[PDB]
């Protein structure tokens, strides 16, 4: 258990890089995904916190979340996870412009809510929640990846986590953009990111398409001057789905529903 021997894993063609690592395709006990973490010299405190997170993520087992096989300290610092052959949700919506029916979109929303509810029931805050970290395995089954890993996503000022934000800003909740608190990541920030994912599903486009600067987006979202306008939602989207996406992207943190409530709402939606 614990760390994986790098001799066992084999790195195939590189796939891409993200906010905190570069993903390689592996072949350890079958097809796996290996992400080489950008951290060059993990602090012993940082490494121990990463090993604790690794154990916690290993314990998790849900249909809508990808398996976290483990880590390896030989090929630099890397994390081995389940490989998903299906395309990401971001590629489906934006890059590939997959034409989903309304019920398929509602199913993707419901399965993402299922996975996120499982993660939050385990006290796992899937920071960096976005359309990139959702894969449509086997055609339509949702697979949430790249959850947790706060000790590795965030750079460390030695024995101190930098405690500054990271990841994509289009999905970032305003309270964690502002960083007014040392711990702005919570279930509600994940709910806001999920609401941005809902906006992408129910619009087919990324929010703030009228803003073409990242710093302008950061400032206007943090100041409350910018919010995803809901006139972009599809006309065939059910009104209660619109209400749910409005409620999830609410500027006030405590106003956002938790994921059991989102699941109840979507279950009401599907039965019409």
């Amino acid at each position: 258990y614990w760390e994986i021997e790098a001799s066992e894993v084999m790195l195939s063609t590189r796939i891409g890089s993200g906010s905190f690592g570069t993903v390689y395709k592996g072949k350890w006990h079958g097809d796996v995904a290996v992400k080489i973490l950008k951290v060059v010299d993990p602090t012993p405190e940082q490494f121990q916190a990463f090993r604790n997170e690794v154990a916690v993520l290993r314990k998790t087992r849900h249909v809508n979340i990808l398996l976290f096989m483990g880590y390896m300290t030989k090929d630099n610092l890397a994390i081995v996870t389940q490989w998903c052959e299906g395309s990401s949700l971001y590629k489906h919506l934006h890059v590939q412009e997959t034409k989903f029916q309304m019920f398929q979109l509602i199913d993707i929303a419901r399965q993402t809510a299922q996975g996120m509810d499982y993660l939050h029931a385990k006290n796992i805050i899937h920071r960096d929640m976005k359309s990139n970290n959702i894969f449509l395995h086997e055609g339509l089954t949702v697979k949430i990846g790249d959850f947790g890993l706060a000790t590795v996503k965030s750079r460390w000022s030695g024995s101190q986590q930098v405690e500054q934000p990271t990841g994509s800003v289009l999905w970032m909740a305003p309270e964690v953009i502002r960083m007014q608190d040392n711990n702005p990541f919570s279930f509600q920030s994940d709910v806001y990111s999920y609401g941005i994912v809902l906006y992408e599903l129910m619009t087919g486009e990324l929010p703030y398409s009228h803003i073409n600067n990242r710093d302008q987006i950061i400032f206007m979202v943090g100041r409350g001057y910018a919010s995803p306008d809901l006139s972009k939602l599809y006309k065939n989207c059910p009104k209660a789905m619109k209400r749910l996406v409005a409620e999830c992207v609410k500027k006030v943190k405590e106003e956002r529903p938790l994921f059991p409530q989102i699941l109840s709402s979507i279950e009401l939606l599907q039965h019409s």
Partner: protein
């Protein structure tokens, strides 16, 4: 044209939030050029549009604009092949030397003003990214501008980006109001302050990105430390760092500014100082 298989990476010049730049060798021609890899997942039509818009860079010829060889999309990444600048960027020079001397900065600011007015006059292009890391120098003493907004689609695609650490954006752009080359002048002024002093000046002698944006929108602009800089340089940066774009000096006023004329008259061994400080 240019293809991925034609390049052999020699070393990593550097990486930014958007992407990474590699010092590569073009095998058919055998010349060392810089290859910037910008990874982004966009539609094929957006890729073609970005390449077409970057093709304008073929006539972007100026002693203050870095050269351009070609651009192509290989695999999930936009690759722009520009001339290799031995000196790197002024961010590297700042990491080398504690603070850039005032005369070299005068030379740098003259180069930045000339490049900005060249882009504006002959291409109607705003740089939008005047940073110390986007001004590149040569072992022969040239100073050139890179990473300017030639492609609007590339700017839109790079809007979906990961959060940054610092910023050199003028308050009018952050607030979203109308912006012009005055924004680039504000960025130049901030860069010149950051290079004259030994640190980023947004938090006047850490802070997250939003706190920095809030400061540079709602707080007085930074100023050079009095007593260790000439009055002409301080006046130049103060005229560049004016929150109101209308009161802020434009390129024409900056060119005839006392500091610019003083620095132009002065003879400074920029190449020798650069070689001494970077080895």
């Amino acid at each position: 044209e240019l293809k991925d298989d034609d390049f052999e990476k020699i070393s990593e010049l550097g990486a930014g939030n958007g992407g990474v730049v590699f010092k590569v060798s073009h095998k058919p021609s055998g010349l060392v050029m810089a290859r910037k890899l910008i990874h982004l997942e966009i539609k094929p039509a957006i890729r073609n549009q970005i390449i077409r818009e970057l093709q304008v860079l073929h006539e972007c010829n100026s002693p203050y604009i870095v050269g351009f060889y070609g651009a192509f999309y290989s695999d999930g990444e936009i690759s722009i092949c520009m001339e290799h600048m031995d000196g790197g960027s002024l961010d590297q020079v700042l990491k080398k030397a504690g603070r850039i001397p005032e005369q070299i900065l005068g030379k740098v600011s003259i180069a930045v003003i000339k490049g900005l007015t060249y882009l504006r006059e002959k291409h109607k292009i705003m740089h939008r990214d005047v940073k110390p890391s986007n001004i590149l120098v040569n072992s022969r003493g040239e100073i050139k501008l890179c990473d300017f907004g030639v492609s609007g689609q590339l700017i839109d695609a790079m809007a979906n980006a990961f959060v940054g650490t610092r910023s050199y954006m003028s308050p009018e752009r952050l607030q979203g109001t109308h912006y012009s080359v005055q924004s680039d002048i504000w960025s130049m002024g901030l860069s010149l302050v950051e290079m004259a002093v030994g640190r980023y000046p947004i938090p006047p002698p850490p802070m997250a990105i939003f706190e920095l944006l809030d400061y540079i929108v709602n707080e007085p602009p930074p100023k050079l430390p009095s007593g260790v800089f000439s009055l002409e340089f301080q006046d130049f940066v103060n005229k560049c760092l004016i929150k109101n774009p209308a009161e802020r000096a434009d390129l024409k006023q900056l060119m005839v500014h006392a500091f610019i004329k003083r620095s132009d008259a002065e003879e400074v061994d920029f190449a020798g100082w650069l070689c001494s400080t970077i080895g």
